[PDB]
Amino acid sequence: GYEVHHQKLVFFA
Amino acid sequence: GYEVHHQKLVFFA
Amino acid sequence: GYEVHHQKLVFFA
Amino acid sequence: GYEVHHQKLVFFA
Amino acid sequence: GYEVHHQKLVFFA
Amino acid sequence: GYEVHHQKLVFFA
Amino acid sequence: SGYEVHHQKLVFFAEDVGSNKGAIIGLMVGGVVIA
Amino acid sequence: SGYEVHHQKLVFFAEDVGSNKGAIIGLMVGGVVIA
Amino acid sequence: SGYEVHHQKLVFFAEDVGSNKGAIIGLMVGGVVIA
Amino acid sequence: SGYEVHHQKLVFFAEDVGSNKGAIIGLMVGGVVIA
Amino acid sequence: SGYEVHHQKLVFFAEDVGSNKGAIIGLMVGGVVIA
Amino acid sequence: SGYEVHHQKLVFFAEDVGSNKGAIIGLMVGGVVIA
Amino acid sequence: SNKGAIIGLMVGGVVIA
Amino acid sequence: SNKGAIIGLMVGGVVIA
Amino acid sequence: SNKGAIIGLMVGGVVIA
Amino acid sequence: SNKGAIIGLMVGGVVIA
Amino acid sequence: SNKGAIIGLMVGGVVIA
Amino acid sequence: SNKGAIIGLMVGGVVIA
Numbered sequence A, B, C, D, E, F: 001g002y003e004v005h006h007q008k009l010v011f012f013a
Numbered sequence G, H, I, J, K, L: 001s002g003y004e005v006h007h008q009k010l011v012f013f014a015e016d017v018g019s020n021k022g023a024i025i026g027l028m029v030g031g032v033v034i035a
Numbered sequence M, N, O, P, Q, R: 001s002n003k004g005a006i007i008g009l010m011v012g013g014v015v016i017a
Helices: none
Strands: A008-011 B008-011 C008-011 D008-011 E008-011 F008-011 G009-012 G024-026 G032-034 H009-012 H024-026 H032-034 I009-012 I024-026 I032-034 J009-012 J024-026 J032-034 K009-012 K024-026 K032-034 L009-012 L024-026 L032-034 M005-011 M014-016 N005-011 N014-016 O005-011 O014-016 P005-011 P014-016 Q005-011 Q014-016 R005-011 R014-016
Touching (some): B008 H009, G024 P005, G024 R005, H024 R005, J024 N005, K024 O005, P005 P014, Q005 Q014, R005 R014
Parallel strands (some): A008 B008, H032 I032, K009 L009, M005 N005, N014 O014, P014 Q014
8 A cells, every 4th residue: 555644743833 | 554754843033 | 445644733822 | 364265076997 | 265176087908 | 285186097907 | 573662742831841941950960060 | 573663743943942151061971071 | 574763864953052051151071170 | 245156067978878789769850741 | 367278188989980981871961863 | 257168078989989980871952863 | 691672771763672 | 582672762763673 | 603693873774684 | 238148949048248 | 138147058168157 | 329349140259248
């Protein structure tokens, strides 16, 4: 199988 | 199987 | 089977 | 008066 | 008066 | 008065 | 067989966590002080 | 068989975490001080 | 068989994390001070 | 009047007093560890 | 009047007092470790 | 009046007092480590 | 004389032996 | 005389032996 | 006399032996 | 606003105020 | 606002105020 | 605003104020 691991940090100000 | 593990941090201000 | 484990932190201010 | 206060440690071995 | 305060350490070995 | 305060360390070996 | 360790942590700290601001710290691990 | 270690951390720190601002720190690991 | 180590970190620090601003630090690892 | 403080100490220590020989020491005064 | 402080100490230490011989020491005063 | 401070110390240390012989020391006063 | 792990102090981490 | 790991102090990290 | 790892102090990192 | 001494940490020593 | 001594931590020593 | 001494950390020594 395909292993996919990401992460996001959307920082508005 | 496909293993997927992510995480998000949406920080408005 | 497919194992998926994520987490979110939506922080408004 | 005269105040005198001393101390000795004779350590043979 | 005269104040005198000494100390000795005689260490034989 | 006269104040005198000394100390000795005689270390034989 | 087959070992499989998954780990996942999201950490958020506010203004001053674990800080020593304005602290007076005297510390000693071994050593000798003849004051 | 087959080992498999996944690790994933998202860290967010605010203004001054773990800081020593304005601290007075005297530290000693071994050594000798004859004051 | 086959080892497989995945690592993934996203770090965000604010103004002054882990800083020694304005600190007075006297440190000693071994050595001798005869004051 | 007149203050007068006399102090007098004779100290003798044997082989290894107050020592950390062979010790494992993990110490933490403030700060942050994200393991 | 007149203050008068007398102090007098004779100190004798044997082989290894206050030593860290062979010790493993991990120390932290403030700061951040993201392992 | 008149202040008067007398001080007098005789110190004798044997082989290795306050030493870090063969020690592993990791030390941190502030700062950031992203391992 | 060890097939495994011998840890003095452990804070987090992963040890597979 | 060791097939494995011998750690004095460990903070995070991964050791496979 | 070692097939593995012998670490004194470890902060993060990866050791495969 | 002090005629005397204000010590945070003191190990030995002599303070006359 | 002090004629005397204000010590946080004291180990030995002499303070005359 | 001080007639005396204000010490943060003191190891031995003599302070006359």
